[PDB]
Every structure is written in C-alpha cells, then in structure tokens.
Enzyme design. Structure first.
Site, short mmCIF file in Angstrom:
data_model
loop_
_atom_site.label_atom_id
_atom_site.label_comp_id
_atom_site.label_asym_id
_atom_site.label_seq_id
_atom_site.Cartn_x
_atom_site.Cartn_y
_atom_site.Cartn_z
N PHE A 1 0.82 -1.22 0.00
CA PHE A 1 0.00 0.00 0.00
C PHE A 1 0.86 1.28 0.00
CE2 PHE A 1 -3.51 2.39 2.58
CZ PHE A 1 -4.29 2.68 1.44
N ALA A 2 0.72 2.12 -1.02
CA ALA A 2 1.55 3.34 -1.13
C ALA A 2 1.20 4.39 -0.08
CB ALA A 2 1.38 3.99 -2.52
N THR A 3 2.19 5.15 0.37
CA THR A 3 1.91 6.24 1.29
C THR A 3 0.92 7.25 0.70
OG1 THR A 3 4.14 6.01 2.31
CG2 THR A 3 2.85 8.03 2.81
N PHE B 1 -1.43 6.76 -1.40
CA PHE B 1 -2.77 6.16 -1.27
C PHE B 1 -3.26 6.13 0.18
CE2 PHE B 1 -1.92 3.89 -5.48
CZ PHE B 1 -2.83 4.63 -6.21
N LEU C 1 -6.67 7.84 1.42
CA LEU C 1 -7.66 7.13 2.25
C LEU C 1 -8.02 7.92 3.52
CD1 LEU C 1 -9.38 4.51 2.45
CD2 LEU C 1 -7.47 3.55 3.79
N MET C 2 -6.99 8.48 4.16
CA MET C 2 -7.19 9.37 5.31
C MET C 2 -8.01 10.60 4.96
SD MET C 2 -3.46 9.07 7.03
CE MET C 2 -2.99 7.75 8.14
N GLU C 3 -7.70 11.25 3.84
CA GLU C 3 -8.50 12.38 3.34
C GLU C 3 -9.96 11.96 3.15
OE1 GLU C 3 -7.41 15.37 0.45
OE2 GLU C 3 -5.30 14.73 0.58
N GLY D 1 -7.55 19.50 1.26
CA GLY D 1 -6.51 19.22 2.24
C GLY D 1 -5.45 20.29 2.13
N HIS E 1 4.39 6.26 8.48
CA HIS E 1 3.93 5.05 7.79
C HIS E 1 4.90 3.98 8.26
CE1 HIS E 1 2.20 3.35 3.76
NE2 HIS E 1 1.89 2.62 4.82
N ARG F 1 -7.80 20.43 6.81
CA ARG F 1 -8.60 20.71 5.63
C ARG F 1 -9.18 22.11 5.75
NH1 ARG F 1 -8.93 16.55 2.60
NH2 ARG F 1 -10.49 17.58 1.24
#
Lengths: 133, 133
Positions: free
Chosen positions: A36-38, A40, A44-46, A65, A72, A116
């Site tokens: 899983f890429a940072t 990404f 996902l967090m956003e 954002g 990570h 945000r």
C-alpha cells in the site's frame, strides 16, 4: 461538528493501490514491493475526513486538504483491511484539523494529523481555471 | 550521499492526477475540483527522493517512505510543471531524512520533511508475505 468526535472508514486494499500504481509513469517504482503506497494511505485518510464532514457542509461547498503529517510504520499487502480512524481535533471557521490513524488488522500502519479548509466549489473552480495554462 | 545536496524532479501534471483519480472507488470525491491531489504530491516527493538515492543503494537494496510532513498551500491544474526540490538532511544508518518542497511554476505548493528507510528487498518482501492473506 464536535471536537473529539471520531469516524471510522474501512478499505480492503486491492492490488492496484501499490506503489507502482500511484505513478505508473515512474520506472523507478516499477519494481518496488507490492505494498500500500503512502500517497494512497494519505488519500484514504482524506477520504475518511471528507466522509465525516460531508453532512456539515452547506450546498455548493467542498473542502481541500492543506496539510498532511503522518508516519507510515508498517507495510500492507493487498487483501488486508485498512481501517482509518479520524478524530476531529479543532474547527477554526473554515479550517478543520483531524488526528488520523490507520491499522491493517495486523499492525498499526501510521498516524498523524491532517488539516482541511472548507471551500466554495464554484468560486474555487473559477480561480483555478485562470492559472490553467 | 552528501548532506545538503539538492535534487530537482520536474513533472508535467496530466489530467489524471486529481483526487478523483487517486480514488476512483470513492463516490464521495466525485465533484472535487480538477487539481493535483495531495496524495499524488506526496508520491511525487517520494519519487524525487528515490531518484536521488538510487545510484547510492547497494544491489538488493530499496527504500520505503516512513514519514511525510508537508503543507499543501496552493492548487495546481493539469498542464503546469511541478518541480520538487529534495535536499538530503542526514543519513543515520538506514534512515535518510529529507527536506522537500514543490512549486508549480507559479506558486510554492507545499513544503516540509520526508523520511525513508533503506531495506533489503528480499528480506522485506519475505516479512510482507508473512502478513499476506
């Protein structure tokens, strides 16, 4: 929307959220681990924060954002479920700050903060169309 | 590697590096503005640091991003060139620390820090397999 309130968002990592799929343009990533890429994880967090704040937006509003500060700390292969917990830390008018954290069912994979800013979508789209070359 | 050396990485932003392209599975992103996504900017920053590191890794070695702490202060439509500047702050064992900044030809778009850890690819991929469904 109340400081301290938490939202949870679960996501089974598919094969196409690995490093090489964030930038298919990038030969330097073509042979990175299939994890899983940072970028990404950040997205996902956003997404979690966006889902949480959506019922609290006036019609025609959105958000962007404005900061991300996370670690990570463990790697996640496709197939595991990443659960992001988003906890509202502060709301200074247009500006919202969240504590974000993620775990994949085996390990905590990362945590930190995300800011945000609420925006007016139609105003914003006009002023981005102008720095468009 | 030498501390304080800056490396640039230039990238022309195509149409498909918006947040809706970061997560197409995310209906909640459907009407987001067509601007360079934070997750993609994070990946672009990593990419710059990866290029900086690659001649200096030994065979069998790779790296993973272990932390990112950046602002994202200006919006970038497709067509502009984002230039990432990556400066090496320190090398401490397997840990390389970076100062990262990005500008889109018009505005500074973000800045902060990024950390990476050198990994033995085969040993890492083995540990990953252990938590793969």
């Amino acid at each position: 929307m109340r400081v301290g309130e938490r939202f949870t968002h679960d996501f089974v990592v598919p094969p196409h959220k690995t490093v090489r799929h964030l930038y298919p343009e990038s030969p330097e990533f073509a042979e990175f681990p299939e994890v899983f890429a940072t970028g990404f994880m950040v997205g996902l967090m956003e997404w979690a924060c966006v889902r949480a704040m959506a019922p609290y937006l006036e019609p025609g509003e959105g958000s962007l954002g404005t900061a991300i500060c996370v670690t990570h700390t463990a790697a996640t292969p496709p197939g595991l479920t990443v659960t992001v917990t988003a906890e509202l830390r502060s709301v200074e008018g247009r500006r919202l700050s969240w504590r974000v954290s993620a775990h994949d069912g085996v390990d905590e994979i990362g945590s930190g903060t995300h800011e945000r800013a609420v925006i007016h979508l139609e105003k914003f789209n006009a002023k981005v169309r102008q720095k468009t070359p």
